[PDB]
Design a binder for this molecule. Structure first.
Ligand SMILES: N[C@@H](Cc1c[nH]c2ccccc12)C(=O)O
Ligand SMILES: N[C@@H](Cc1c[nH]c2ccccc12)C(=O)O
Lengths: 321, 321
């Protein structure tokens, strides 16, 4: 089984576009890949963070992942700071990185040093679990290139212990776009909140967002990205939440116009969110969430401890015992 | 009781000058201060290190410290990489440091990034134990200034949990100088090996070093740094190893010349090293050294765990449990 590692920032709610694009996909591929979902609280404090909200946001992301169907027995869901191996391996790889390498990543009151020194810690996050694949976007290509180079450097200078990962998402979800700007990806931090549907949006608010999506006044329900990106995006969301094949959506709405389809889809979005948020609340407000995160932490520790031990031995840190 | 923290680099043997200047002093002040002697193996890999020798050098320094009389019940002697709190707190303080701050420390194949990012890890090493005093030299003033500023910054932004240290050596030992250049401090890395007496020099070699020290051909045994730095340095070494007051050395050698005094002192240096190295061997080659380092590691962990827990809570890392 190939090992997958996804680092999750605890600084904002995934949208329905995030869920159709990755989360729902992870819920499937966790059966066929050894999956690591790391809530990277130590990467989050490289950026401005409010101390009193950060713990909450970390609990929210774990709750969202679990409510999506991320399964704590099949996968390893854990918080980064709770597994010391991350800053242990991250310091080790920082020593073999170069200032220039780190500086070129920042190009692709003072400037907080975490924004400069996080890339070796990201590399450590991945290789600690002998990761084969990382499902990241093109904005992280430099980070994986640095990771592979640090793995080559480490193995060549000390001895082969670390695994080079590849960027790879085993099952790419459909692309969901901004509801009032269908050429851009949907983003949780849009200034126009009608552009995204958050997984924690009020369900009624989210149906209104479907009704407010920018489309032609009417038309056929047909998939056509280039000419009708507005209705097409809506059809992609319909597909993502129902699992209806797109051609099967076209058949169901043959002879129907936008009013019927948008009304139906808004009810689908509403219903998905009512079900998702009830699962989300029951995870977020339960004592067992702390047990689940403890188990995840323990599983990540048992694997990365061996990795960090091999690294320390290879570099001559610590003691032979 | 005030808490003291000394970071020990595992990259070369202390000399008799190091022992008279600090080690013998620590053996006394460990009764009246809560003393932390940290073998900083993670700072050592910021610099070129051979993986196969580094573990040895770390065991050597622990053996040297114990042979000096550093007492593992009175003090805390431990290896830095064995206590995860150091890279945990070190990452936390790196996030609030600035690139400029780190860059200005480096002024006072590529340039290894550890040489840039170690100062917050040094700051972490100290404050983890609520250190009051650090016995360091003027070459570390910038490091302690950064440490105090990071402590102010941390306490002000998150909440008061960390203690500002001062540079202070409770009992300054005598200054020992190069045996063939008595204006410079004695250094373990001199290119002229007759300048230093290593604690692991062959005892016979070390007496010859006393006999080879650069002095006048003859003279009175009198302390006078400005006019007779050569014989004066030798008298300071005689004092350091015998505990004879300098005026009492002058009395014993009234009417004597350099030949008698140097011959005596060489026998004293030889005898000190025979006793020190027998203690050094028995620590270095015993199984109980690993027990002593385990106990030291455990003591350092029990204290710095609380400190790192307060820092994580103050920054909002991890979980409330
Ligand atoms: N750097 C990623 C988060 C992250 C940290 N470590 C990772 C390892 C793999 C993938 C992602 C990550 C981000 O900014 O979102
Ligand atoms: N930087 C010190 C070693 C060190 C690391 N942490 C410390 C804390 C206190 C004193 C010294 C240290 C040196 O170069 O020698």
């Amino acid at each position: 089984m190939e090992t997958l590692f996804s680092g999750i920032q605890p600084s904002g709610i995934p949208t329905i576009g995030n869920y159709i694009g990755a989360l729902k996909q992870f819920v499937d591929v966790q059966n066929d890949y050894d999956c690591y979902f790391c809530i990277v609280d130590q990467h989050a404090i490289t950026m401005p963070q409010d101390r009193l909200k950060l713990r909450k946001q970390t609990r929210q992301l774990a709750a969202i992942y679990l409510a999506s169907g991320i399964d704590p027995d099949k996968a390893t869901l854990f918080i980064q700071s709770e597994v010391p191996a991350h800053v242990q391996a991250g310091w080790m790889l920082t020593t073999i990185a170069s200032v220039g390498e780190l500086e070129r990543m920042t190009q692709y009151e003072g400037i907080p040093a975490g924004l400069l020194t996080y890339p070796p810690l990201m590399a450590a996050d991945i290789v600690l679990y002998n990761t084969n694949i990382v499902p990241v976007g093109d904005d992280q290509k430099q980070h994986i290139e640095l990771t592979r180079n640090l793995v080559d450097r480490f193995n060549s200078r000390y001895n082969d212990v670390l695994v080079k990962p590849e960027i790879r998402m085993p099952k790419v979800g459909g692309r969901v776009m901004s509801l009032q700007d269908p050429t851009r990806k949907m983003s949780k931090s849009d200034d126009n909140a009608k552009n995204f549907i958050s997984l924690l949006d009020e369900p009624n608010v989210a149906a209104k967002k479907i009704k407010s999506a920018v489309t032609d006044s009417d038309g056929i329900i047909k998939f056509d990205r280039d000419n009708k990106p507005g209705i097409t995006n809506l059809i992609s969301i319909y597909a993502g939440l129902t699992d209806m094949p797109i051609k099967d959506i076209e058949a169901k709405y043959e002879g129907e116009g936008y009013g019927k389809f948008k009304g139906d889809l808004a009810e689908i979005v509403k219903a998905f969110l009512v079900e998702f948020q009830e699962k989300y609340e029951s995870f977020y407000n339960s004592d067992k969430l702390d047990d689940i995160l403890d188990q995840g932490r323990d599983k990540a520790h048992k694997v990365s401890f061996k990795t960090v031990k091999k690294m320390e031995k290879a570099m001559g840190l610590g003691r032979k015992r």
